Each structure stands twice: as C-alpha cells, then as structure tokens.
Design an enzyme around this catalytic site. Structure first.
Site: not given
Lengths: 284, 136, 73, 314, 157, 73
Positions: C8-10
């Site tokens: 993901s990104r977080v």
C-alpha cells in the site's frame, strides 16, 4: 517484458545466469574449503624423503636399487584426472604435453606406456591414442593410497624390472588459486633425494633392515605420497577453473545476450506501426 | 611423562603429535620396552594397539595398520601409512585394471557441485532456434 | 497475496502501536526466506544462516497465513 | 534536467535551495505544478511552514481534477509572473512538476481534435513548445531566468519525444539512486552520470579539471576495488585497495556536506560548502595525503574545511 | 527484402540474388549474397558430381558451422569436437577463399585481379574441405582465386 | 517436408492392410530421432538408450528421402 524470442531468450539467459552463479558459488566455496582444508599433505613425503635421505648416506651408499630402475627400452607417460565438468586447460595441456613429451621422447627409438587415471584418462588415452596399460577408475576429490594400488602395482613391474626406464608424470598442477600449470616431471627412475645426504649419520647407524626394506618401502611411500598428495591440484584446479570461469563468464558471455533485450526497447515502436493500419481502416 | 617428540605421520596429513617418554611399543623383532634415551634404530610397526604414554601421563593405545619406526638422534619419526601391503590386496590391480581397462572402463565420481547442474545445462542447452537468432 | 508485489502507501505505521514497531517485517522474512531458500538447486549445503530462514519463513509464512473466508479479529 | 528516483525529495531541494540560493544570490525562486494529487497539497504545503519559503515562492499547481485545458494552462502564470522579477533586477527560478500533463494534454488534445500529427502517439506541437519553451529560460542583462527542468520520461522511451526532447532540450541531468541514500548519507546525488559538458572537460580550469578528473578517476577506479573484490577476499589488498578504499569511502562519506535544510528542521548545521575547500581538498587530501580522518568523525562536515579539525579534535 | 520487389522479382525473373551486409562488412572480395538463390543448372542431372558434391558439402558445412553458434558462441570451445574444427575450418577456408577479384573488382579494393578456371575451382572443393588442402591458414586464403593462388600463396608464404 | 507437422485427415484408414499395419515408423521414428539430437546438447550425454535407438530410428530414416525422381510404384 518480451516478444516471442525475447521471452525465451530472457528466461533462458536468466536461468543460465542463475544456475551459473549458484554453481559457481557452490563450486568456489567447496573448492576453497576442500582445497584449503586438504592442501597440506606433506607429512609422508617430507618425513619419508627427509628421513630416508637424511639417513641413506650411511646405509644406502653401498647398494641402491632405485638408481638404475628399469632398462632403457621404452618410455612411460601419465594422464591428468578430470572428474568434474569444465576442467579448463587440462585437455589441451594433457594431450599436448602427453603427445609432445611421449612423441618427442619416444620418437628416437622408445615405446609408449601411459597410465590413465581419472575420468579424463579413459577418453584422452584409450579413445585418442598412445598406450593404455592401466586405467584407475573411481577416484574423486578424496584420493588415498588404499584405492591407488593400480598405479604402484601396475607400474611396479614396468619400472623396477626392465621395461621403461624414463617416464613423464603429466598431471594438472596448481601453484596458486587461479594458476593451473600442468607439470610433467620424470618419474619411475631416480628421485635423487639428496636433501641431507651430504653428511654421515651422527647417531647409531644400525637398524633391522637392508637394501630391500630401505629401497622398497621408500618408493611406495614417496611415490604414493607424492602422487596421492599431488592429486588435489586436479580437482581444485578444475573446480576453481569452472567456478571462476562460470562466475566471470556468466556476467560477460550469456549476460551479453541481455544487451540484445535493449533492442527490444525499440520493438515496442514497431507496435506504433500497428496503429498506422488504423489510418486505412479505423481512422480512415 | 614427556621427553622426546614422537610425532606420527599418516599417508595424508599428520596422525599424532606431542612429546613422549616411556613408549612401551612393540618393535620389529617383537615386544619391547623403549623409553627416553634410546639410540637410533629404524624398525617396523605392524597391526596392534600399543599402550604408550603421551603428554602429562596419557597412556593411550594407538592402533594402526602400517608403521615405520624412524628413530634418529633423539627423535622418533613414526612414518606410518594408511594400509599395509602383503597377501592379495594389490594383487588384483593387474587383472582388474588390465581386464577392466582393455575393453571398457567407466569413471563416476561424486561431484556434488556438478551433478545438480544436469537439468539446467541439459534443459537450457537445447532449443537452438531462439539462441542463434542473432543477425549478422 | 504475492510476496513483495502487494504493498500500500501508509503501511503498518498508520495502524496500532503493536503492529507498527513490533509487527512489520514481511520483507525481511519473505525476501530472506524466499531468496535464501529458493536458490538451493545447484547451490546446496546450507549453513546456519540459510537453514534458520526455512523453518521460520516456511513455518511462519505457511502457518500464519489466513485461509479462504477466514475471519480475523 | 533531473533523473533518478527518491533519496533527496522536495524537502531537501526546497529547504536547501530556499535558504542558500536565496541568501547567496539576489532573486526570487518560484515553483509550478501540473498533474499533482489532491491530497499532497494538504501535506506538502505544510513543508512551507518548516522552512519559511511560502513568503518567497509562488506555488502554482493545478492538481488533476480538471480537464486538459483547465489544468494545462499554467504556462502563462510562470512566464508572465516570472518575467516581472527577472527583468527588474532579481533572478527568477521556476520549478516544474512533471511532463505527463503537458505531454498527455498536448498529445491527446492536439491529436484528438480531428487532425493528424506526429507518430508513435505524439503530436506535432512538441518541437514548438519544447524548443520555444526550453530556450526561453536563458540569462539576460537584468537577471538570469532559471527553471528546474523536472520532466518525466515515459519509462525511458527513446523512440518518443521524451528522450529526444528531454535529452536534447535540457543541459545537465543529475541522477539520484538508492545506493547513495541507503547507506545513511546526506546527499543522495551520486557523482556518476551527474555532470555537464563544461564540468569535466578542458573548458574550465585546473581546479575543475583536476577535481573532476581526480574524483571521477578515483571514484571509477576505486568503485571496483570494494564491490568486485568482496566475492573473493581481502588477502590481495595492497596500497591501492587500502588507499582507494579509505580515500573513496572517507571522501564519499565525508563529501556530503549538510546545507540549510536540516538547520530549521532537524538541528544539524553546516551552512554552505565553498568551492575552495571542495576543489582544493578533494584532489590532494582524498588520494594519498593526511590519512588521519576516520568514518564517524568525518561525517557532517562542510566540504574539506571542517574535516581537518575533526581528525585531531574528535 | 520484405516489399514487392523481392517477392515479385524472386519469382517473376530468373535468379534472386541479393547484397547482404555480412559479405561486404567482413572485407571479402565478393560482397554478394551467394547463399540466397541459384540458377536452374545446379541440381543433379544437368549439374554433376562437382556441383552436387560442392553444393552438398558447402551447404552442410556452411549450415552446420553457421548454425552452430548457439552451442559454439555462448559456450565457447568447451563442448566442441571435430564438427566445430572441421566445419569452421572448411566453411571459413572455403567461404574466405571462394571470393576473388574480377578486373573492375580489383582496382576498387587493393589486391590484384586474376581470372580463375572451372577445373581448379570445381575440383578444389574436394581437397580443402576434406583434409588434403586443409593445411592452409586464414592469411593464405585471403584474396585467393581457386587452387593456383591458394596453393602458391599457401605453399610459398 | 518436416515430420510432425504433416497431419493427414484420413490417416492410415484409406489404404490397404500392409500400408496401415506396416506404418510403425511415425511416432517411434519421428519421436525417437528427436530425443538423440536434443538430449546430446550437454557434455556428451549419450549412453545405451541414446545409441540403441539412433541406429534404427535416426540412421534408418536418414536414407529414406524423396529426391527429384521419387517414384512410388
């Protein structure tokens, strides 16, 4: 990313590079550990040569059976062992040194009596030319004096009775970690172990033996210790040459084919031509 | 006790090391009791365990096949071997090597770093229609 | 999910405190176990650094993964 | 031009360039943006509160929620607003975001209007906009017009106009890989493939020629002694391996001087590195002279001026 | 070679010759694609033992040596035998010695021009590619006609 | 004509008894000859199975080729 031939060439180049890197790393680790842990056999050769030569000046000075050896009527030879894949320069130096030393040393009026040893001796002597007196099969990377009775037993009747006086022990030597130099010293004749025979015996010059025990047991210990101890250069030179050649050639040889994949970066431009036909159909 | 260095050398590397004193080992003529102060007498050591004191009173029974008692001026170089040579043993090397080498001989060693690469080189060395597609 | 391809990104730092600094090492066990255990065909004879990632990586990755329609609290 | 991946980021270039270039040279450095995210504007703008640049930069971004004509029309703000400061006495310095908005909006809007253009999915207005817009950022008599060419290529497309227009329209292109920032250094820009045509040739001087030739030859000739020799062993390490490894590791790990980016964000100083210390110290003391500086005490030093006292005082 | 001139000229005319870049880029004395197509008098009845044996041996040696690059180029000379040395020596000696000048082709390069015959060129393929005249090297076969330039240049230099 | 790609529709049912029963050199002669040429790509990987089928499958099918005057009477 590929295109028919680029996919199979990239997959085969990646599998060949990974297999060559894994085989080169395993062969380099096993060759460095086995060569570093087995390249120290000098107790029998140093103890038998120093003990026999240091005390033979007051006992073997009258009669010596290892001087005349055999009669001058033939010429012996040998062959290097190569049980592993990609031996390197063992086939060129073995056939070149054995054919040049046997042909040049036997072309004057001598015969041939080569001794095959290892996997390369069955195809470089029996399937090429020369002579095939005995071929020792089943050596490996762990050579010993118990399984090497074919050389001393088969060569004991041709070097200490009257057949081949001078020979040539051609074997793939290794003086460093990446320097496979094949040496062909003259064996089965005269060792001339004069490391400490310049002086007499300062201690008690008496033992329970004679010329047969001092000239017969020393030849088997020195010949078996030198031939058995010197066989590590063939496996270490073949495994080290195959590991260094596979690791060094894996990044410059087959990996160079990966450079052709760069041309595939232009092949996508050809896909733009597939849109040009749309100008004659879709775009009209 | 310990006195003279009675190191034993095998066919490959070193067999035993360290000093020795009252080494009650059998000689060539039979059972003998040598110690510290014997002269040079090159004998032969056959098979059998001989209880000899090593270092700090270590009476160990060193048993080996072959052996060469190389005694010099105060030294005790026991030049031993891996196996002795006598009846038979090396007598079958002429008929086995000559009969097995005069027709067809096969050599198959271990090669742990080369036997596992048979499927990669044999399976990847085929299909020359994609590998030889380089134009000139 | 694939190993190293799904990210993901977080990340795990946006969740709870127990799943940020104490439960966030999928790249080390997946890359070390898959990279150190996948190249065992031509290069055998594993040492102590390669044998420890097979049991922890294979046992943790094969025993800590959820099945089909499995609820996780 | 600019290349590479991450490592530096917008905070290092904006924070380090908003204080050193603003005080060392008179001029206003602005920025732009075409084709950004809707949430980044709610976070990256917070960086303006950590370096005091919001009062000296005009953030002109269009995000991406609009169409092509409503978001790609940011060329009049930069050229019309940057010409008032560069032609008065100061020096304007814009900063672009990417080329996806101009390339996708220009090629899609120029090719989807019912007219034919270029090939390979390109438009015929790339030479006029790239050549006319690339040559407009030049030096003048009232101030130099600088612009950060932050164009993004289409995954290294040599057949399209990204490699030809980006490589033929810009000048120097610096690349920043993950190897210079993964070890724990300050500057992520490596010295390989990060120079101009008048920086390593014979069109400068003995300082740039000796420093570029010595640093390039020492880095290229010393980069193989620590990577290719690690697979065999360190037994054959002579004076070239120890001097090249110690000088390359100490010079490479100590040459990354910290600017004013960490002075009001992290707490580390350094001010600005001068050309006399980096040009008259990396060509003599970083080859085989004064081998008293280690690896821990030589870090966070301003060029070679602060590294001389750290070898004897730390 | 993928337009209408190759497909139309290759079937609507007699021979379908070409000019490949491998012959002119290597520095030969022919600079023509002789392996593309031939005439109708190169079979068995109207040809003969010289054209049939030379075409079969040159085609098999050239196809095996030219097609053995996948096993002799990447792997090198490790897994080679008599086929690599015989095919490489016969294909390299016949291909490198089969080219010669032709008056106008002599002044445009540097070597001289000598008109060869059919007995030496048609009869020389059974000795250089078999083992009789295979003792020459690479420098002795460069810019050679048939058997006079190869035998005189290889035996006199 | 290369063997393998020439697949007939009727096959051997539209012939006599000797032509249909004596056509054993299709999959055996076409598949046995391809294994010796592709399996010997290593360091001379030939044994009893590679040489026992090459004399009756590869060497026997090498002399049976249609020339210019091929007459099947």
């Amino acid at each position: 990313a590929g295109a028919k031939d680029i996919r199979s060439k990239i997959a085969s180049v990646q599998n060949t590079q990974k297999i060559t890197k894994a085989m080169e790393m395993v062969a380099a680790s096993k060759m460095r550990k086995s060569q570093d842990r087995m390249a120290a056999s000098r107790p029998y050769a140093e103890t038998m040569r120093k003990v026999i030569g240091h005390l033979a000046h007051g006992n073997l000075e009258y009669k010596h059976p290892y001087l005349e050896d055999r009669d001058v009527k033939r010429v012996g030879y040998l062959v290097v062992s190569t049980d592993r894949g990609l031996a390197g320069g063992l086939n060129i130096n073995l056939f070149k040194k054995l054919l040049a030393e046997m042909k040049t040393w036997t072309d004057k009026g001598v015969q041939a009596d080569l001794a095959m040893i290892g996997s390369k001796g069955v195809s470089f002597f029996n399937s090429v030319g020369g002579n095939v007196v005995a071929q020792v099969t089943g050596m490996g990377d762990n050579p010993s004096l118990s399984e090497l009775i074919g050389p001393v037993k088969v060569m004991l009747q041709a070097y200490d009775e009257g057949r081949l006086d001078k020979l040539y022990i051609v074997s793939n030597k290794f003086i460093n970690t990446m320097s496979q130099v094949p040496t062909i010293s003259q064996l089965l004749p005269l060792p001339a172990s004069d490391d400490d025979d310049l002086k007499h015996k300062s201690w008690d010059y008496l033992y329970e033996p004679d010329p047969k025990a001092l000239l017969d047991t020393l030849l088997r210990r020195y010949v078996e210790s030198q031939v058995y101890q010197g066989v590590v250069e063939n496996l270490a030179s073949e495994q080290a040459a195959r590991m260094v050649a596979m690791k060094a050639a894996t990044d410059n040889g087959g990996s160079l084919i990966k450079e052709l994949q760069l041309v595939y970066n232009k092949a996508r431009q050809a896909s733009i031509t597939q849109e040009l036909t749309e100008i004659v159909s879709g775009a009209a | 006790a310990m006195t003279y260095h009675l190191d034993v050398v095998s066919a490959e590397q070193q067999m035993f090391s360290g000093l020795v004193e009252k080494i009650q080992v059998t000689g060539s003529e039979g059972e003998l009791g040598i110690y510290p102060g014997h002269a040079p007498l090159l004998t032969a050591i056959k098979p059998g365990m001989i209880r000899i004191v090593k270092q700090h009173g270590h009476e160990e029974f060193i048993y080996l096949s072959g052996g060469i008692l190389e005694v010099q001026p105060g030294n005790v170089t026991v030049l031993a071997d891996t196996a002795i040579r006598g009846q038979d043993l090396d007598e079958a090397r002429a008929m086995e090597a000559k009969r097995k080498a005069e027709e067809h001989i096969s050599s198959s060693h271990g090669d742990v770093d080369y036997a596992q690469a048979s499927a990669e080189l044999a399976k990847a060395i085929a299909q020359l229609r994609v590998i030889e597609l380089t134009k000139k | 999910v694939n190993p190293g391809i799904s990210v993901s990104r977080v990340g795990g730092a946006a969740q709870t405190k127990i799943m940020k600094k104490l439960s966030g090492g999928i790249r080390t066990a997946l890359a070390q176990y898959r990279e150190l255990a996948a190249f065992s065909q031509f290069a055998s004879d594993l040492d102590d650094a390669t044998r420890n990632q097979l049991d922890h990586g294979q046992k943790v990755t094969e025993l800590l993964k959820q099945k089909q329609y499995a609820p996780m609290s | 031009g600019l290349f590479g991946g991450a490592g530096v980021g917008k905070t290092v270039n904006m924070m380090e360039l908003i204080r050193n270039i603003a005080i060392e040279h008179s001029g206003y450095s602005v920025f732009a943006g075409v084709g950004e995210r809707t949430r980044e504007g709610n976070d990256f703008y917070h960086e303006m509160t950590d370096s005091n640049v919001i009062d000296k930069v005009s953030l002109v971004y269009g995000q991406m929620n609009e169409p092509p004509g409503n978001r790609l029309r940011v060329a009049l703000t930069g050229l019309t607003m940057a010409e008032k400061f560069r032609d008065e006495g100061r020096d304007v310095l814009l900063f672009v975001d990417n080329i996806y908005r101009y390339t996708l909006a220009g090629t899609e809007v120029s090719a989807l209007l019912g007219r034919m253009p270029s090939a390979v999915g390109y438009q015929p207005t790339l030479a006029e906009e790239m050549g006319v817009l690339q040559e407009r950022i030049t030096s003048t008599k009232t101030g130099s017009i600088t612009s950060v060419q932050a164009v993004y290529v289409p995954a290294d497309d040599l057949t399209d106009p990204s490699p030809a227009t980006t490589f033929a329209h810009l000048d120097a292109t610096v690349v920043l890989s993950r190897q210079i920032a993964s070890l724990g250094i300050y500057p992520a820009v490596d010295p390989l493939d990060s120079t101009s045509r008048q920086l390593d040739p014979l069109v400068v001087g003995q300082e740039h020629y000796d420093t570029a030739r010595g640093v390039q030859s020492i880095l290229q000739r010393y980069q193989e002694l620590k990577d290719i020799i690690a697979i065999l062993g360190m037994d054959e390490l002579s004076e070239e391996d120890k001097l090249v490894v110690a000088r390359a590791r100490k010079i490479q790990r100590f040459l990354s001087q910290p600017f004013f980016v960490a002075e009001v964000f992290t707490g580390s100083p350094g001010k600005y590195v001068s050309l006399k210390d980096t040009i008259r110290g990396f060509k003599g003391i970083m080859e085989g002279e004064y081998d008293h500086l280690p690896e821990q005490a030589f870090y966070m030093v301003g060029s070679i001026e602060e590294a001389v006292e750290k070898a004897k005082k730390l």
